[PDB]
Design a protein around this ligand. Sequence first.
Ligand code: SF4
Ligand code: SF4
Ligand code: SF4
Ligand code: FES
Ligand SMILES: [Zn+2]
Lengths: 39, 209, 62, 67, 114, 89, 130, 677, 54
Amino acid sequence: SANYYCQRDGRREVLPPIDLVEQQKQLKLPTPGKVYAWD
Amino acid sequence: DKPTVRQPDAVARSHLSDFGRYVAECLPKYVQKVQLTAGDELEVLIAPEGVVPVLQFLKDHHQAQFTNLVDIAGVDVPCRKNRFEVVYNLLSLRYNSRIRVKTYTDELTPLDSACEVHKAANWYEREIWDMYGVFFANHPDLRRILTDYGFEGHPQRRDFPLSGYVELRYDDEKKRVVCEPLELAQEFRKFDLSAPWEQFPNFRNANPP
Amino acid sequence: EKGPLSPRFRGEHALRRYPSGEERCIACKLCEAICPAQAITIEAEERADGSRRTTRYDIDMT
Amino acid sequence: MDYDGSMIPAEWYGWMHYKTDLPPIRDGCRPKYKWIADHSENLSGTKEAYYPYSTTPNKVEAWEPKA
Amino acid sequence: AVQQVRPILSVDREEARKRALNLYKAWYRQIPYIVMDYDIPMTVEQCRDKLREEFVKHRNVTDIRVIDMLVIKGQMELKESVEIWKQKGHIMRYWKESQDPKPTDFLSKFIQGV
Amino acid sequence: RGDIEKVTHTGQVFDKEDYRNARFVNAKRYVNENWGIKLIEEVPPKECTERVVFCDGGDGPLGHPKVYINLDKPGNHICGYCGLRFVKK
Amino acid sequence: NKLSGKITVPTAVNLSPISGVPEEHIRERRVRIHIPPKNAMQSGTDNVNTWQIEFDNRERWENPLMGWASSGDPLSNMNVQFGSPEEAITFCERNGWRWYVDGAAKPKKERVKNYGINFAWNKRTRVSTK
Amino acid sequence: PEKIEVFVDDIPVQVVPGTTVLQAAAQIGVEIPRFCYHERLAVAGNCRMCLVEVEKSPKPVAACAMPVMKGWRIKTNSDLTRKAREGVMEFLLMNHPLDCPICDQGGECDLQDQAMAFGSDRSRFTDINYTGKRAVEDKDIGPLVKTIMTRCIHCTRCVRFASEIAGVDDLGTTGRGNDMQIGTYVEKLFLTELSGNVIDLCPVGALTNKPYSFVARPWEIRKVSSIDVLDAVGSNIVVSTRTNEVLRILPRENEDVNEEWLADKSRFACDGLKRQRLVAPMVRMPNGELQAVEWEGALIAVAKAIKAAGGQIAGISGQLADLEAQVALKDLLNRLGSEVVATEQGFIAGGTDNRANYLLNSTIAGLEEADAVLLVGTNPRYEAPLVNTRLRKAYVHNELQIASIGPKIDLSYDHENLGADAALVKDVCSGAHAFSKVLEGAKKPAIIIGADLLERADGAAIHATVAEYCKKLKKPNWNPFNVLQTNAAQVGALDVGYKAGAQTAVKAQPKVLFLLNADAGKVTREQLPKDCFVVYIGSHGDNGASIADAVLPGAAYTEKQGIYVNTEGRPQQTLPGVSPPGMAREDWKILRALSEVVGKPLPYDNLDELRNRLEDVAPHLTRLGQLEPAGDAGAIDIKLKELRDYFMTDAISRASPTMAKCISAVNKQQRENEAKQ
Amino acid sequence: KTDDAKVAPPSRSEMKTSMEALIHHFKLFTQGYQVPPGATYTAIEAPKGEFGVY
Ligand code: SF4
Ligand code: SF4
Ligand code: SF4
Ligand code: FES
Ligand SMILES: [Zn+2]
């Protein structure tokens, strides 16, 4: 019980891709991620 | 509280998101759009002319430093006027992040070559040329890779029959193998696996013209 | 001397029969629908008893 | 000297492969139905060989002028 | 109904012929070597004759771009025959000697099935 | 030879003048000796009290999916899957 | 006097020779641009929202050996999808095929589909049962 | 009527007031799961699967039957909707049985599909281990519909369809509670020309084709668009082929003509295309046995006879011959110099010229709009069932005044019988009868005359008066005059320019004869000139084929690509789904080969060459899918007044085994009525 | 196994008794499972190296 599929399903949860510029239009130099010392 | 449903790396989404805007506002003439696919990867949609500038920009600039060019994945999509799409999926060891660059082209116009940018691509352009027919300009040697010699047509297109048009055998009159029109013992039985009921509402009206 | 294998080994195909001896297959045709190689062909009808059963059931182990 | 790999019968096959640790002499829990055939070798390259053939009676009936 | 689009190689129909005829030079000049190198029945005159017909295969090509690609294919096949990457089977492929010319007039089609 | 004479339970014999007979000049025409129609016929029709019975044919998860068969009609009732037969009377 | 070598060429460029399809198929086969038919005993209709093209059936005989459905015709299964018929016609020309569209359907005319008509005093449309 | 603004799922939408929520959601594009709702049936709330939440809803509402109201907010995919849908399906799937693998609707079952999309994935039903599920005795309903009611979900699609569309009224529900069943309280046979359509309506596999039983699965099978040919409605069909076998037939939604229904004949006679087939050319020896021969000798022998017969030739086209076969036949005979090209079903003398004299000018779609319909001895229920149901839709939604001037028949609804004698049509055409006043007062009058009567005798006068009265009845954009054609080739014949009446061709006294699959008894060699050499170019070896000295096989309609002009007049194209059997070829190919064997070649070596030859003859006739207008138009006892007459009509019909079973079953139920008494 | 019976097939034991387990068994094996539209890349430290599928 309390085991509804609707409130635990993933496939119905995913969204389309978002446009970042348009995200801003709705609204430390940036770096893709933690720098790795692949050296 | 949904163990089945994974939870992406949010902070990774943060960095990629702000960085993506960085790329868009640093290459205005080329970057047509920058989007963040829900799978946390980052896509960079460019016009065909800026292929090399984007790649050269990425591999070189400090903040990108995307050195490795993993592959050149070719996608075919009829009903797009210039259909043949290309994907340059890159890696950055310095920052430990992945990025995807994408562009389009038709079956006729040529396309820029990444041979002069990453030596890694050389074989890939040969591969797409063989598999779709997307010409590459300035490519050193555009010899076919996979298909056999004297093969006509590029099979990975979606307007090409699965089994091809011809098939080989061996002749005794001629002591040699001859290509013949197709002839199948059991015709490949498709199955029409089409959904009658829309199983996904979220993508329904989203991404409309 | 020979072996060993495990109970799950995948080898020669076989169409089983119920403990009465009746054919188990009912021509539901899922086996064909899933078969990655499309090596299965099935054609089913009604036996005179009115039961849903196969007429031809073919596998190509090539 | 005509030994073959298929000479093993069904009830012993599993034991012979370390597939069942229960000798057939010991486990009488396996089925003992009637229709079960008796074993056979890889009858190949011989008049006893299998050969496939259509298992569907013909599809379309031809018109009979006499009738 | 015109489009202002990129080139590939040739900017005008005459440059296209210039490229197309360059290929015809390589192929004409190559034929004797392949007669020697590839132990196949074909003789020089027949190979030359086929080369003529196989250009005639597409005479009414019109677009500059299309004719450019046809030449691109030829330059490739030239090199694959120039060097001996191909095989006797592959080179003979141009003749299609395994299948008899199928019937063409209506009765022969009709009497031999669709 | 009888091998190329027997009637497959599916109901096929190559016609006496049919070139597809030729394939068995040197190989046997396997035909199975157990015909499900005869066997299930032999099995007697089980009977019960309740208006509605259930069959799985085999046993546990070794049989076909559990199915409920009503018996209120006068006649027999054949299990869809296994062909077992039920009669309430 | 150039834009990276841009050229003026007609939009409709036939590509039959470069394509690689044998001329036999090109010259003896048509294409049947249409919308896939709606399955009769279904009710969801999200697989008939696309414009589809395919090639006419050629032949199917049965293998003498095993009674399969032999077919020596390559573009039998071939099937492609489009968003609108004009797109498909544009594609079909560019690949130098012969085709003939098949008009799908006019917009559905609104049906009143009222509930009250089931229960009327005078009109014949009174339901016999519920 | 200004359209309301309602925010379906946070999207403004336009609806004419009174529109139902569901009908608006589709308008925008969203689809709600339904079971008891269908476009062409009365509205009911049964499944409760169409439920949906409206902002500030005390109670979720059934979209299927909820008229929209101003400024609403329908939250289709909001969690409350999702909660509702899952609960409803848990309910439906409690005691549906575990019979997907043996259920013929497997992989085509809305319950499966909507379970996937909108239902849960775990079984809270724990009572399978304690007391199990419910079960219901299956019903005997006919030799066509196999019934397994233990799968029914009581959606009442069958109940509503039968009561309204077919008006059978004999199928209904019984009992309260979970034991409510559907069927007939006492064993009967659901006998009805449209009875097949219930199999398409039943969303679950409770009702299914008896013939197409267990044969194939939808995922395996292949769909080919096509058109029905066994009736002059020309309904659109989806021929369901799998590996050179036409397994079944389904309606293709073409609401201008097909209406999405489909009669039993078209539905079930498909088996006829597998028996009594001609698979080898035959020529009658001195023994006379029509042994099998090859194409070379056959056509050469035929060309021999034609050349040496003496230029006295005729061609009588059957009823399953596509227009290409007619045109190929005519052109060849014009080379030979013989214009004697008749059609089996005769027609008006000296009125075959204006297109509107042999059609349904009333726009079969428009029939439902009809207001006063006069059927002079023309039983649609067995002459055009799809037309019949269109009339019933009018009778139910527009108060259609339906009189009759023929013998007794039953149209599934009340109709005023004014008598039978053909003098009645004259008095009505003068306007001297009460229903004539009704016709005058109406706004969409229709007068339907059956082509049989127009060929009965001295009926050209009947037609002329009918056209005379239609002059006054004409309302703008509406031509009353209507002619329910019967054969699917008659209108084809008229547009190519044949004569009408097989006796016409016999009266020509031809030395040789041609028969495009003409298997009607209207011509018999006794009735032919004795020396008349007879050639038959048809598919099924029926009796009419039995009386020929040369018998060329032909591929049936599903197997050949041809053009058929339907009754109203639009031309439609069959597509070939199955390889023809034996040496069978296309009809237009047989004629073309024979011409070039004789030495008078036709010009058209390809279908398009022939289709352009038709374009020459009739540009209207090649504007496929459209209907060019024709404007102005110019005792009684009839066949097919009972179903027993209906089932056995054509060679394919007689060829089919299922139809023969149907005839026997109806005869036996009648005998039961006599003896069970 | 992932708990989503709409994604991975159900067990045989549950299949032969409950209903939507059978439906899910039926639909998964015949039609498979709709995957939400999108493009995705992944890589793994395969022994040869970074083997990847786009
Ligand atoms: S058709 Fe295949 S999956 Fe279905 S019961 Fe028979 S063998 Fe099993
Ligand atoms: S109607 Fe048939 S396919 Fe649908 S759920 Fe029931 S048994 Fe399965
Ligand atoms: S028999 Fe079929 S159509 Fe009739 S109520 Fe039951 S499920 Fe609905
Ligand atoms: S569709 Fe609304 S209750 Fe069934
Ligand atoms: Zn059972």
